[PDB]
Design a protein around this ligand. Structure first.
Ligand SMILES: CCCCCCCC/C=C/CCCCCCCC(=O)OC[C@H](COP(=O)(O)OCCN)OC(=O)CCCCCCC/C=C/CCCCCCCC
Ligand SMILES: CCCCCCCC/C=C\CCCCCCCC(=O)OC[C@H](COP(=O)(O)OCCN)OC(=O)CCCCCCC/C=C\CCCCCCCC
Ligand code: HEC
Ligand code: HEM
Ligand code: HEM
Ligand code: HEM
Ligand SMILES: C/C=C(C)/C=C/C=C/[C@H](OC)[C@@H](C)[C@@H](OC)[C@@H](C)CCc1oc2c(O)c(OC)cc(OC)c2c(=O)c1C
Ligand SMILES: C/C=C(C)/C=C/C=C/[C@H](OC)[C@@H](C)[C@@H](OC)[C@@H](C)CCc1oc2c(O)c(OC)cc(OC)c2c(=O)c1C
Ligand SMILES: CCCCCCO[C@@H]1O[C@H](CO)[C@@H](O)[C@H](O)[C@H]1O
Ligand SMILES: CCCCCCO[C@@H]1O[C@H](CO)[C@@H](O)[C@H](O)[C@H]1O
Ligand SMILES: CCCCCCO[C@@H]1O[C@H](CO)[C@@H](O)[C@H](O)[C@H]1O
Ligand code: FES
Lengths: 49, 241, 97, 73, 181, 66, 29, 365, 99
């Protein structure tokens, strides 16, 4: 049955802030995205310079 | 002979990756070129204006140019004439042509020195060793008239008699003009003459390293970010049994 | 038409009128024994070399049959103490030392 | 060649996580170094021998050249 | 090598009734190839130093084998190019071909680029028209408010048309035809 | 006026490598000069000596120069 | 800030060697 | 899209696949810097060397553009040899059309770099021009005529320099067009990958995966290039070219540009004119024969240990040739060079194909 | 023992570390592409998965745990009968072409 299909554990790859399956990850999504967005903006300024 | 003697490495103050030329040394080195080397060697690609902001002020360089006379013209009568030199003039050539140069030097041709440092393996280490390296011929060696034994010159027989020695000139800053001091400054000047962009390229080098020090880890982080989706993907094969 | 046009263009790359053979006069007194003198002639080094008796003798002793381009020294000079040559290596054109 | 017309694949399941849900350097050093060491060992017997041979010919040759230019080699 | 060489030429569907006015497009292509070939052969003998430019052109015409024919073909080729250009544009205006908007606008850019190319080529021999043509035409930029003068001197590489100008005009003249292609 | 080069050279010539090189050179001088006919000269021995000495000089000399 | 900071580092590494550093000795306008 | 962004790419191509985009970047950087140099360079033999020094001394930032062009040529070759090496090791040459166009690209870049090197009219420029054009003299009956025709005279002179500037100027653009065809042919099959096994079952979009890896690779190329330009601009060059051309004197230790040393070592290894020119030409054209000498049932060397050893022997041998080319024609270098030259052709023509067959037998096919 | 050296070579070759079978590594020419097309569904789907798994490992520069490496003694040619026939058919056509 397709219902036997289960996503494998990814705990070994997850950022620490999304390790608790009983907590919403939206609470850290802004920070998680902000970081990546900081890297991009800075790369762009460096390249423009 | 076919044997070779390579110059050792001197600790030039401009030897380091971020190390600029010593401009006071360039200033003295120019004096050496002016009083000594210029009577036999041209420096075709260097002009008085090039010295401004490097080792002399504009007024000092103007006074230096004026110390010489250069041909100009034709004038209204179609005549060439002499005038005091100016900033735009290139350093005067000791000879009208290489033939005259050879004739005045027992057949040997003093090369132009604008690039001597870049045109010789060893650079200033070579020029310095050559200049301070004359000695008596070793036993068994006899050089034809006009040649001098210099162990650093290819073949060891050079047509330039030792050009410098203690007190060959007086420096404008009182610096003791020993032969080695004179060699060190003229070598510094020759480096500058062959590579005036020397200091600027190292300053840009510093900025380039700093920028790459930032941009490389950032782009690498972006690469790892995007690729993480593939790096952690898991595969399962579920064929119907 | 094509043959003419193409050859005219190909011809433009060949030596122009200004490039095409004046003789040259050389003063032998100015060349000391043992010296190889080079001159620019017809756009190439011309060597005029004053040989010593030892050089002349060594060249005489060469086992000619074993040379890749067999010639006796005396077939190459008019006066043994003088060897005159086009100073261009027959391999790829450099100037022999 | 475009996606949709590459080839026939059946019964394969792929699971992936958004990049924002995961570390970009998971076990960078703890697992990275070991893997680099495995990969190095896996090839050195194939890559190194020729360069050691070069290194040997080079030092021998250079030294042989120097010895041949002096009076008493 | 089949297609685009495929269905792109041989089996290209063409109106059965296009007249001679439709020949100018291929003629422009031929003028372009003629200019490029003669130009390249001239570039093989031309020097852009103001002290040798005029002389190198006379050398081409006098001493280079068939240099005179290659030189005059290049010069008159430019004129033929323009005759064809104007006929081509005229055909487009009369027949409403400009309704092919993209084709027509790229055409307008081609016209401006060929004009700039011919202008620069004309400066290369460094005769009187070359010099004054270079002075006047580059100076058109000086009509630009406040920066026009700066632009002109920048193009010239100095305060007047001189050595720097001729050398860069040879490089621009060299590459533009390929961009035009 | 004393050129530090002279001083530095004397101190450097004290090193064993230079004394050894100097000895092979003096030996060569003796050998060569004692002949009337020889194609030999002492360039090799001199270069060996200068190489050892100048390597040392290079490490010190600039400390005495402006 | 990058340019000024970098130049400062460069000039410090080369203290007393650059023209800007010895210039006063010859000027006096 | 379906030309770039959505281009299907193997999910596992490594850093060795970055060199194609790096070559493209090298080409563009050479073209841009070259164009700016052409704006100040004059090809008259009386002003060529001087105009280069003027660029380096009085043109604003002329020195940086000049040294970027010079070191750019070196970076170009480093990338070229890596690119070819990748293709040989992974069996990429089985994409016949792409590979053969590649061989033509190699010869064209070599011709281009050679001519550019003549432009400053230094000693290496003059003698390089003399020697290389003279390779054509080895052609029976018409060789000498061809040389003089190329030269525009009986010796390298004014006519030669002027036409070399024009050829140097246009060839890069021709190279660019040919490189575009090189790519068109590659897109028909898509890229090969380290395993040499079809990757149609695991393709990923070119963007963002390889667009970002390419940018990273490009940054490292710029880093390598600028480290040379700003900290060691002359490291890879020859001091002899800082001396104006002298047609009456060939420097005694003259040697080719570093990226030509191996071929030079090979030509120099043969004491016969025609023999050396034929071996020089073959050392490059043998590339076009590699596809025909492939005996292995597997495409890539990844799974072929014996082939790998030979491959690395070949790389070490090219390093040996590169080193020998930089040495005088004296013992023991003459013999090492002849052995290395023999080994080169032996590895490619006999040993590798043989190893291919032996591996097939070991795997029972 | 030729077989001693064979098993040594098999492991040195190392495609087994990526869980591949020898036939999974064959260079795909036209004969091979036709043989693959003729494979029964299960063998075809298996080949596809072993290659996908290998490409994925290669991408990560990783290999399988040693217990999962294809074993020399177990690797058999699933492609041979199909490929041999495809090659015999083509040889036959060529003979007729020569006539
Ligand atoms: C890109 C393709 C390159 C290939 C070469 C293109 C050649 C084009 C073919 C020409 C067709 C037009 C006919 C012209 C008739 C000219 C008559 C002629 O040839 O007279 C010969 C005469 C020399 O005579 P003599 O010096 O006294 O002595 C000769 C004995 N040694 O040469 C000439 O008059 C030169 C003629 C110049 C032709 C103009 C060049 C045209 C080139 C165009 C290239 C593009 C393609 C166009 C398509 C072709 C359509 C026909
Ligand atoms: C041309 C003349 C120029 C002179 C030659 C000088 C060359 C100097 C050597 C530089 C080469 C760098 C070597 C670093 C590579 C080391 C390495 O990692 O090798 C092992 C590694 C194992 O990889 P896989 O089999 O795919 O398995 C993956 C398992 N995780 O092998 C590779 O990376 C293979 C890729 C090599 C291709 C590039 C080789 C360098 C090229 C040099 C010259 C090329 C030859 C042809 C020139 C003729 C004209
Ligand atoms: C004329 C009396 C000279 C004076 C004064 C100086 N030099 Fe000279 N120099 C001269 C000749 C004739 C030669 C040619 C030597 C030969 O046999 O070829 C030289 C050579 C040099 C060299 C180049 C050596 C080489 O490797 O080719 C250098 C770098 C050099 N000279 C430097 C130099 C400097 C800096 C001088 C002033 C301190 C100087 N020379 C003076 C003749 C004369
Ligand atoms: C659309 C293409 C081209 C046009 C319209 C064109 C036009 C011109 C013009 C009007 C002149 C002046 C001719 C004269 O009166 O002497 C000229 C000169 C020149 N052109 Fe071009 N040209 C073209 C392409 C090229 C190309 C591709 C090159 C070089 C690769 C080239 C090289 C030269 C040279 C060297 C001269 C100087 C010699 C001379 O004046 O004849 N041209 N060109
Ligand atoms: C001006 C020089 C060249 C340019 C710009 C160029 C560019 C490229 C590019 C962009 C790619 C795809 C990316 C990659 O796989 O690296 C590529 C692939 C390829 N190139 Fe080149 N190339 C050049 C010269 C050559 C040469 C000289 C050869 C070989 C003699 C060659 C053989 C190949 C092959 C076989 C491929 C596919 C490799 C694979 O898929 O594994 N290229 N090239
Ligand atoms: C495949 C691209 C190219 C390669 C590999 C290349 C390489 C070189 C090389 C090796 C030199 C000698 C540099 C030196 O040591 O001084 C050179 C010189 C030169 N190149 Fe290029 N070049 C390329 C493209 C171009 C282009 C497109 C132009 C011009 C439109 C150009 C213009 C010049 C000029 C004017 C010189 C003489 C000035 C100099 O020596 O730097 N090159 N080139
Ligand atoms: C670096 C490159 C640059 C700056 C190129 C810019 C090119 C601009 C234009 O092309 C797009 C331009 C050629 C085009 O204007 C639309 C022409 C119709 C200009 C026509 C033109 O010619 C003259 C000319 O030739 C002369 O020669 C002796 C003399 C001239 O007066 C004394 C003129 C003149 O008064 C005008 C209006
Ligand atoms: C009009 C255009 C023409 C005629 C272009 C032809 C180009 C031919 C080839 O490219 C395809 C050629 C560049 C390529 O041969 C495969 C190179 C590897 C040749 C390498 C090469 O370099 C040398 C060199 O650079 C030198 O400089 C100082 C000096 C040299 O000996 C003294 C050489 C030399 O002995 C060889 C073999
Ligand atoms: C990146 C590795 C560079 C190796 C350092 C030495 O590099 C060599 O230096 C010689 C003169 O010093 C040059 O004539 C030669 O062309 C150059 O390759
Ligand atoms: C490149 C050298 C190839 C030598 C053939 C390898 O031979 C193999 O070596 C293994 C480990 O030593 C042994 O366990 C194995 O029984 C033997 O057949
Ligand atoms: C890419 C090359 C495709 C080759 C397709 C071969 O196809 C085969 O040809 C045989 C002829 O001997 C037929 O008897 C057989 O039924 C057919 O499947
Ligand atoms: S040995 Fe080759 S040109 Fe003389």
């Amino acid at each position: 049955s397709h219902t036997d299909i289960k996503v494998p554990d990814f705990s070994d790859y997850r950022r620490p802030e999304v390790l608790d399956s009983t907590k919403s990850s939206k609470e850290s999504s802004e920070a998680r995205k902000g970081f990546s967005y900081l890297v991009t903006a800075t790369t762009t300024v460096g390249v423009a310079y | 002979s076919d044997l070779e003697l390579h110059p050792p490495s001197y600790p030039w103050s401009h030897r380091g990756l971020l190390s600029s030329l010593d401009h006071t040394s360039i200033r003295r080195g120019f004096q050496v070129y002016k009083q000594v080397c210029s009577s036999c060697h041209s420096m075709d690609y260097v002009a008085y204006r090039h010295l401004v902001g490097v080792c002399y002020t504009e007024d000092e360089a103007k006074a230096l140019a004026e110390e010489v006379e250069v041909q100009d013209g034709p004038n209204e009568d179609g005549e060439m004439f002499m005038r005091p030199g100016k900033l735009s003039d290139y350093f005067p050539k000791p000879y009208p042509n290489p033939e005259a140069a050879r004739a005045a030097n027992n057949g040997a041709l003093p090369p132009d020195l604008s690039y001597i440092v870049r045109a010789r393996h060893g650079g200033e280490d070579y020029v310095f060793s050559l200049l301070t390296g004359y000695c008596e011929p070793p036993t068994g060696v006899s050089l034809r008239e006009g040649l001098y034994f210099n162990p650093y010159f290819p073949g060891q027989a050079i047509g330039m008699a030792p050009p410098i020695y203690n007190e060959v000139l007086e420096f404008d800053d009182g610096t003791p003009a020993t032969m080695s001091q004179v060699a060190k400054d003229v070598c510094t000047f020759l480096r500058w003459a062959a590579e005036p962009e020397h200091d600027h390229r190292k300053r840009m080098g510093l900025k380039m390293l700093l920028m790459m020090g930032l941009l490389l880890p950032l782009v690498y982080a972006m690469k790892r970010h995007k690729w993480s989706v593939l790096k952690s993907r898991k595969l399962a094969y579920r064929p119907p049994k | 038409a094509a043959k003419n046009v193409v050859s005219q263009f190909v011809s433009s790359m060949s030596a122009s009128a200004d490039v095409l053979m004046s003789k040259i006069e050389i003063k032998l007194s100015d060349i000391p024994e043992g010296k190889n003198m080079a001159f620019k002639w017809r756009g190439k080094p011309l060597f005029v070399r004053h040989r010593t008796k030892k050089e002349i003798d060594q060249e005489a002793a060469v086992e000619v049959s074993q040379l890749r381009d067999p010639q006796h020294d005396l077939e190459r000079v008019k006066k043994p103490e003088w060897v005159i040559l086009i100073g261009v290596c027959t391999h790829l054109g450099c100037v022999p030392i | 060649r475009q996606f949709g017309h590459l080839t026939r694949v059946r019964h394969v399941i792929t699971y992936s996580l958004s990049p924002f849900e995961q570390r970009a350097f998971p076990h960078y050093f703890s697992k990275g170094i070991p893997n680099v060491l495995r990969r190095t060992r896996a090839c050195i017997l194939r890559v190194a021998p020729p360069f050691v041979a070069f290194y040997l010919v080079y030092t021998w040759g250079t030294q042989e050249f120097e010895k041949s230019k002096r009076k008493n080699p | 090598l089949m297609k685009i060489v495929n269905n792109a030429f041989i089996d290209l569907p063409a109106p059965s009734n296009i007249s001679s006015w439709w020949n100018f497009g291929s003629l422009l292509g031929i003028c372009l190839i003629l200019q490029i070939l003669t130009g390249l052969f001239l570039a093989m003998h031309y020097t852009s130093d103001t002290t040798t430019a005029f002389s190198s052109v006379t050398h081409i015409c006098r001493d280079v084998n068939y240099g005179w024919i290659i030189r005059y073909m290049h010069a008159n080729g430019a004129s033929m190019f323009f005759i064809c250009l104007y006929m081509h544009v005229g055909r487009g205006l009369y027949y409403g071909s400009y309704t092919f908007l993209e084709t027509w606008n790229i055409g307008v850019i081609l016209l401006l680029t060929v004009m700039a190319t011919a202008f620069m080529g004309y400066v290369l021999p460094w005769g009187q028209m070359s010099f004054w043509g270079a002075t006047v035409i580059t100076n058109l930029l000086s009509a630009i408010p406040y920066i026009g003068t700066n632009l002109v001197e920048w193009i010239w590489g100095g305060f007047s048309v001189d050595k720097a100008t001729l050398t860069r005009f040879f490089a621009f003249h060299f590459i533009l035809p390929f961009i035009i292609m | 006026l004393v050129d530090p080069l002279t001083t530095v050279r004397e101190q450097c010539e004290q090193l064993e490598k230079c004394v050894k090189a100097r000895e092979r050179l003096e030996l060569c001088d003796e050998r060569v000069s004692s002949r009337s006919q020889t194609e030999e000269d002492c360039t090799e021995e001199l270069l060996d000596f200068l190489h050892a000495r100048d390597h040392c000089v290079a490490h010190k000399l600039f400390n005495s120069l402006k | 800030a990058f340019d000024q900071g970098a130049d400062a580092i460069y000039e410090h590494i080369n203290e007393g060697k650059l023209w800007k550093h010895i210039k006063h000795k010859y000027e006096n306008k | 899209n379906n030309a770039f962004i959505d281009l299907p790419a193997p999910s596992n191509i490594s850093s060795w696949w970055n060199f194609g985009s790096l070559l493209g970047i090298c080409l563009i950087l050479q073209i841009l810097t070259g164009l700016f140099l052409a704006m100040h360079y004059t090809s008259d033999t009386t002003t060529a060397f001087s105009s280069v020094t003027h660029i380096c001394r009085d043109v604003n930032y002329g020195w940086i553009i000049r040294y970027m062009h010079a070191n750019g040529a070196s970076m170009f070759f480093i990338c070229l040899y890596m690119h070819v090496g990748r293709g040989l090791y992974y069996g990429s040459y089985t994409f016949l059309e792409t590979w053969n166009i590649g061989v033509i690209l190699l010869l064209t870049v070599m011709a281009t770099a050679f001519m550019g090197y003549v432009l400053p009219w230094g000693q290496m420029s003059f003698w390089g021009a003399t020697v290389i054009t003279n390779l054509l003299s080895a052609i029976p009956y018409i060789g000498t005529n061809l040389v003089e025709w190329i030269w525009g005279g009986f010796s390298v002179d004014k006519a030669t320099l002027t036409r070399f500037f024009a050829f140097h100027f246009i060839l890069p653009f021709i190279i660019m067009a040919i490189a575009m065809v090189h790519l068109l042919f590659l897109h028909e099959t898509g890229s090969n990958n380290p395993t040499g096994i079809s990757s149609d079952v695991d393709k990923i979009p070119f963007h963002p995966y390889y667009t970002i890896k390419d940018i990273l690779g490009a940054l490292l190329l710029i880093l390598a290039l600028m480290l040379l330009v700003l900290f060691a601009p002359d490291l890879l060059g020859d001091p002899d070219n800082y001396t104006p051309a002298n047609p009456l004197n060939t420097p005694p230790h003259i040697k080719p540009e570093w990226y030509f040393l191996f071929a030079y070592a090979i030509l120099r290894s043969i004491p016969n004119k025609l023999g050396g020119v034929l071996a020089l030409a073959f050392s490059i054209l043998i590339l076009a024969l590699i596809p025909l000498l492939h005996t292995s049932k597997q495409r890539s060397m990844m799974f072929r240990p014996l082939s790998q050893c030979l491959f690395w022997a070949l790389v070490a041998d090219l390093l040996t040739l590169t080193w020998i080319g930089g040495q005088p024609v004296e013992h023991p270098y003459i013999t090492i060079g002849q052995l290395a030259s023999v080994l080169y052709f032996l590895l490619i023509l006999v040993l590798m194909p043989t190893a291919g067959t032996i591996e097939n037998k070991l795997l029972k096919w | 023992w030729l077989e001693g050296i064979r098993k040594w070579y098999y492991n040195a070759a190392g495609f087994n570390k990526l869980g591949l079978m020898r036939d999974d590594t064959i260079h795909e020419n036209d004969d091979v592409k036709e043989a693959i097309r003729r494979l029964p569904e299960n063998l075809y789907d298996d080949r596809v998965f072993r290659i996908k798994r290998a490409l994925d490992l290669s991408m990560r520069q990783q290999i399988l745990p040693k217990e999962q490496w294809t074993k020399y003694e177990e690797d058999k040619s699933y492609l041979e009968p199909y490929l041999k026939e495809v090659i015999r058919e083509r040889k036959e056509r060529e003979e007729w072409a020569k006539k």
